[PDB]
mmCIF file of C-alpha atoms in Angstrom:
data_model
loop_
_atom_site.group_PDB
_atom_site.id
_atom_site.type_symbol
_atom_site.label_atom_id
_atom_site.label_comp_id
_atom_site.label_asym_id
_atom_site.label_seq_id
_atom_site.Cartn_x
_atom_site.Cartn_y
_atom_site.Cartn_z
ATOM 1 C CA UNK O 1 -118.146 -10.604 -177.973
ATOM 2 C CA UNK O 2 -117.133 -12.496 -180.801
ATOM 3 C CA UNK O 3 -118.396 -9.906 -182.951
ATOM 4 C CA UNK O 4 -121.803 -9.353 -182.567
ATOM 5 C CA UNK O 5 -122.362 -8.696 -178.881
ATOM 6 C CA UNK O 6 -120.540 -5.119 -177.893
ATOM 7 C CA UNK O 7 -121.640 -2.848 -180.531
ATOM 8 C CA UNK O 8 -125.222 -4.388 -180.191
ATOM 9 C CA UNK O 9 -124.884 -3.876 -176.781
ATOM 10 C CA UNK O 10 -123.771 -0.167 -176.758
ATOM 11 C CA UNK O 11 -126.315 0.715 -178.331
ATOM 12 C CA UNK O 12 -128.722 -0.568 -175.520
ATOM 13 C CA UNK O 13 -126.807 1.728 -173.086
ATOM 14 C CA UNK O 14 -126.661 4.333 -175.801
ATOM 15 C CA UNK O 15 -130.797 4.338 -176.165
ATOM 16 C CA UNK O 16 -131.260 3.608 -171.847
ATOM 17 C CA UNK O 17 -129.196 7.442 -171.715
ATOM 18 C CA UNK O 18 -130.592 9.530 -173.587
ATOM 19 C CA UNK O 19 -134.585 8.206 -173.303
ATOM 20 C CA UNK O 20 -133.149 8.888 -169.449
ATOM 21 C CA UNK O 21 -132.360 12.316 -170.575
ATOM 22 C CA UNK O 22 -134.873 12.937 -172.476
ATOM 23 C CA UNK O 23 -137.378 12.319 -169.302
ATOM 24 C CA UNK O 24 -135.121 14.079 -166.823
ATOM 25 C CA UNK O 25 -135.342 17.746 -168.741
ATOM 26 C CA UNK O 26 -139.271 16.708 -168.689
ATOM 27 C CA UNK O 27 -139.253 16.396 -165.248
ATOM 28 C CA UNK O 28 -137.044 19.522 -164.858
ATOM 29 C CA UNK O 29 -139.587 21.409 -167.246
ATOM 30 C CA UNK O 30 -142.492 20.581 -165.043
ATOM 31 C CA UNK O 31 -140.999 22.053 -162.473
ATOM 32 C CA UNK O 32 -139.522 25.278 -163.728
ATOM 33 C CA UNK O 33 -143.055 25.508 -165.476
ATOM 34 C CA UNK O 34 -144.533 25.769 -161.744
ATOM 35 C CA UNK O 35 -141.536 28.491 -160.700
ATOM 36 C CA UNK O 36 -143.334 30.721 -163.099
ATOM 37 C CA UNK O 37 -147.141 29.585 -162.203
ATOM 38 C CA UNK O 38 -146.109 30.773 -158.493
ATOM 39 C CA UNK O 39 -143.718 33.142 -159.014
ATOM 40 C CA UNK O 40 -146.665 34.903 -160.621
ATOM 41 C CA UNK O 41 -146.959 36.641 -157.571
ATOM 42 C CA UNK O 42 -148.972 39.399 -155.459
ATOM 43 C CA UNK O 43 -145.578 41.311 -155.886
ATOM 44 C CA UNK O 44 -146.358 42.283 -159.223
ATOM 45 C CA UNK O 45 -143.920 45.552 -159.217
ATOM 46 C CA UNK O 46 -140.936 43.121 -161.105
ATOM 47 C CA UNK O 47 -142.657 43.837 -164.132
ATOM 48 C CA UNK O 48 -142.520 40.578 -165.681
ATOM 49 C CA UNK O 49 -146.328 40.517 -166.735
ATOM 50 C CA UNK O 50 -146.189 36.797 -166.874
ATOM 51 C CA UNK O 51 -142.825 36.394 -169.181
ATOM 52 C CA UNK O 52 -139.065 34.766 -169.132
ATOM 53 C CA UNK O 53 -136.862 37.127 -167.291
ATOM 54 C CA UNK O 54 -136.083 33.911 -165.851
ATOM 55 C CA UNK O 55 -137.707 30.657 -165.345
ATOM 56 C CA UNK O 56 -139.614 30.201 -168.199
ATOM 57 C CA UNK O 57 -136.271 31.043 -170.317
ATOM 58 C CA UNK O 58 -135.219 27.841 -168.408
ATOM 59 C CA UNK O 59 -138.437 25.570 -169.687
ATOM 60 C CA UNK O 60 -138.742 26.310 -172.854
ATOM 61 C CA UNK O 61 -134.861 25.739 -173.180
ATOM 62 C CA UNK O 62 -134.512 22.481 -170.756
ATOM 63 C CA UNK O 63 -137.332 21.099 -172.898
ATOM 64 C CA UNK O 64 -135.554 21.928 -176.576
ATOM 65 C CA UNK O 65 -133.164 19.775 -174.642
ATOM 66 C CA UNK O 66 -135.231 16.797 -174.233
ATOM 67 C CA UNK O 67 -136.721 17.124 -177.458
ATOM 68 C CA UNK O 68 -132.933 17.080 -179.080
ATOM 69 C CA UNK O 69 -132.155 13.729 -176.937
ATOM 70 C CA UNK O 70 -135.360 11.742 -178.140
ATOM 71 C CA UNK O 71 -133.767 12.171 -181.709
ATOM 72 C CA UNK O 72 -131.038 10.537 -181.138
ATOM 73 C CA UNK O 73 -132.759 7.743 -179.603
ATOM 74 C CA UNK O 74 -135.592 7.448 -182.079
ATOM 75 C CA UNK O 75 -134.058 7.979 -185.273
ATOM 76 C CA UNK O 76 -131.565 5.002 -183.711
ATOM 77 C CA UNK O 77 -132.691 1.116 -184.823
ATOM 78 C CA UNK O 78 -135.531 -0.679 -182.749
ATOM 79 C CA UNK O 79 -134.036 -4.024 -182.079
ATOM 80 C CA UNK O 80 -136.546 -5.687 -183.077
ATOM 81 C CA UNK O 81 -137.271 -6.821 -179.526
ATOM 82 C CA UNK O 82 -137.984 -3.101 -179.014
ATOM 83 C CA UNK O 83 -140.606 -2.941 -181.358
ATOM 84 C CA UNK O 84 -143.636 -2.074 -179.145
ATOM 85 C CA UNK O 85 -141.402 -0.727 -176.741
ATOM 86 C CA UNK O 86 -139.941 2.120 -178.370
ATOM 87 C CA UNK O 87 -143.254 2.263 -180.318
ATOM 88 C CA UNK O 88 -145.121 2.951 -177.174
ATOM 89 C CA UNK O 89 -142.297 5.179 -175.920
ATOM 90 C CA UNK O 90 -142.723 7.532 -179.290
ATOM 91 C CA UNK O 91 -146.878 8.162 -178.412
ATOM 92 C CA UNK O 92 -145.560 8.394 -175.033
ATOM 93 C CA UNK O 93 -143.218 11.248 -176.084
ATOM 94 C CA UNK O 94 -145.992 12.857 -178.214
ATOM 95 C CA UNK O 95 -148.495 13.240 -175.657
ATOM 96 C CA UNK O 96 -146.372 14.844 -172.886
ATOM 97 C CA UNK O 97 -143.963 16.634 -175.120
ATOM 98 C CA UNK O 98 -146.690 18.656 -176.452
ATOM 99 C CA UNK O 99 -148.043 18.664 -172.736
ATOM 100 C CA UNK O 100 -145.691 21.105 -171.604
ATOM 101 C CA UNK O 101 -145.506 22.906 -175.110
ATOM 102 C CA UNK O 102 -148.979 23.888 -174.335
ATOM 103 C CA UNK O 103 -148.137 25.409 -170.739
ATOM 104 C CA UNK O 104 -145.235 27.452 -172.276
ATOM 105 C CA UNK O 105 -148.056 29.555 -174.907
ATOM 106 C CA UNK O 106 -149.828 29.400 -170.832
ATOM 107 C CA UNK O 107 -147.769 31.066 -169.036
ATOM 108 C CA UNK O 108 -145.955 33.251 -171.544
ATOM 109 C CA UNK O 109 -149.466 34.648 -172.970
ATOM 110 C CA UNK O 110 -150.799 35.333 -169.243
ATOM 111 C CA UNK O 111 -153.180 32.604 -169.431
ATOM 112 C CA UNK O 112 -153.395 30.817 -165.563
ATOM 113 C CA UNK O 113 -156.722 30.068 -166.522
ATOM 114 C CA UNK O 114 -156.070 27.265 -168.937
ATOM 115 C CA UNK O 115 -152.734 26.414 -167.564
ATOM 116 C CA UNK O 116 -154.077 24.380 -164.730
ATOM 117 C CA UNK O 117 -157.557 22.707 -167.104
ATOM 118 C CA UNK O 118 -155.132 19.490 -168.415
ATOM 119 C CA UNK O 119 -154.104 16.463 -166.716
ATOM 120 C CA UNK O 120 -150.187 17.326 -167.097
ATOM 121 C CA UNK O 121 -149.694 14.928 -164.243
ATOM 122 C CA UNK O 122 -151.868 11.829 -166.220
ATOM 123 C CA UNK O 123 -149.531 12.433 -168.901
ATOM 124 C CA UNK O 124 -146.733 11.579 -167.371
ATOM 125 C CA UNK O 125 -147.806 9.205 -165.278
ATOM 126 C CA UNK O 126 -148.743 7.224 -167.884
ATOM 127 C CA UNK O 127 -145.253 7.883 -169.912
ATOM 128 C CA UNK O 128 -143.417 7.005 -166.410
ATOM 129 C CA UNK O 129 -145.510 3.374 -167.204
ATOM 130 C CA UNK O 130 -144.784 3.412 -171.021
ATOM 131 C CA UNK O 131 -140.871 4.311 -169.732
ATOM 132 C CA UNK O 132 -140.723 1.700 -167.441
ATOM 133 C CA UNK O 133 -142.439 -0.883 -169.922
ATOM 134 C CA UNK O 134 -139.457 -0.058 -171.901
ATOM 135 C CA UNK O 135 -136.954 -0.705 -168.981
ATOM 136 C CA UNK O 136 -138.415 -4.266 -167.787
ATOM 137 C CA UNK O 137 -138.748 -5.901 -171.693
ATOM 138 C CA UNK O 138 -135.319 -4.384 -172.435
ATOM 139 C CA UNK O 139 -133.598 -5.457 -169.151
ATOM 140 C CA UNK O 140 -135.559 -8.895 -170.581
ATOM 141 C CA UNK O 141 -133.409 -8.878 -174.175
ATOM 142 C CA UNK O 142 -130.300 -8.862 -171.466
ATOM 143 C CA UNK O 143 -131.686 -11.172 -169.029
ATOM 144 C CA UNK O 144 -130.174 -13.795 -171.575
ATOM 145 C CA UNK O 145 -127.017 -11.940 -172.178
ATOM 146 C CA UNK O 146 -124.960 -11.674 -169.480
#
């Protein structure tokens, strides 16, 4: 206030939503991923030889979702505080975004058999760390405004 301090800090709340919506979906994905992994089920007869009909219409789209947040996060100004904070956030992004995107050709194309070799869970775990890294050094730029 005074200038400076409202648009600058806007923009804080503006990049903790959508990095918060751009988990979210990739929680939601990982789960809707697993609706199809079970629902591939000794039923059989809804003859839905692996594909959409439902849930994984919902993970490819809840992901394009998450994908289409990030971008308005990361092509938005690292301050400069949030240097290696969004930086860590981006490989973050890149490891489990492509994560999923590789259990989607899974259990679209039939194949079970690689969709559980990965460790999907390691790679988020590790972004719910890079996340929360995030979180604590930018609560830290406010922990001086307030």
């Amino acid at each position: 206030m005074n200038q400076q301090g409202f648009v600058i800090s806007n923009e804080l709340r503006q990049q903790q939503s959508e990095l918060t919506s751009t988990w979210d979906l990739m929680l939601q994905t990982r789960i809707n991923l697993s609706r199809s992994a079970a629902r591939m089920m000794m039923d059989a007869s809804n003859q839905q030889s692996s594909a959409k009909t439902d849930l994984l219409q919902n993970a490819k789209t809840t992901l394009a979702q998450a994908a289409a947040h990030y971008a308005n996060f990361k092509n938005m100004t690292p301050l400069p505080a949030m240097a290696e904070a969004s930086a860590n956030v981006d490989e973050k992004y890149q490891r489990y975004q492509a994560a999923l995107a590789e259990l989607i050709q899974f259990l679209d194309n039939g194949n079970m058999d690689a969709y559980f070799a990965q460790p999907t869970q390691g790679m988020q775990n590790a972004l719910g760390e890079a996340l929360g890294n995030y979180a604590r050094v930018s609560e830290n730029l406010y922990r001086q405004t307030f």
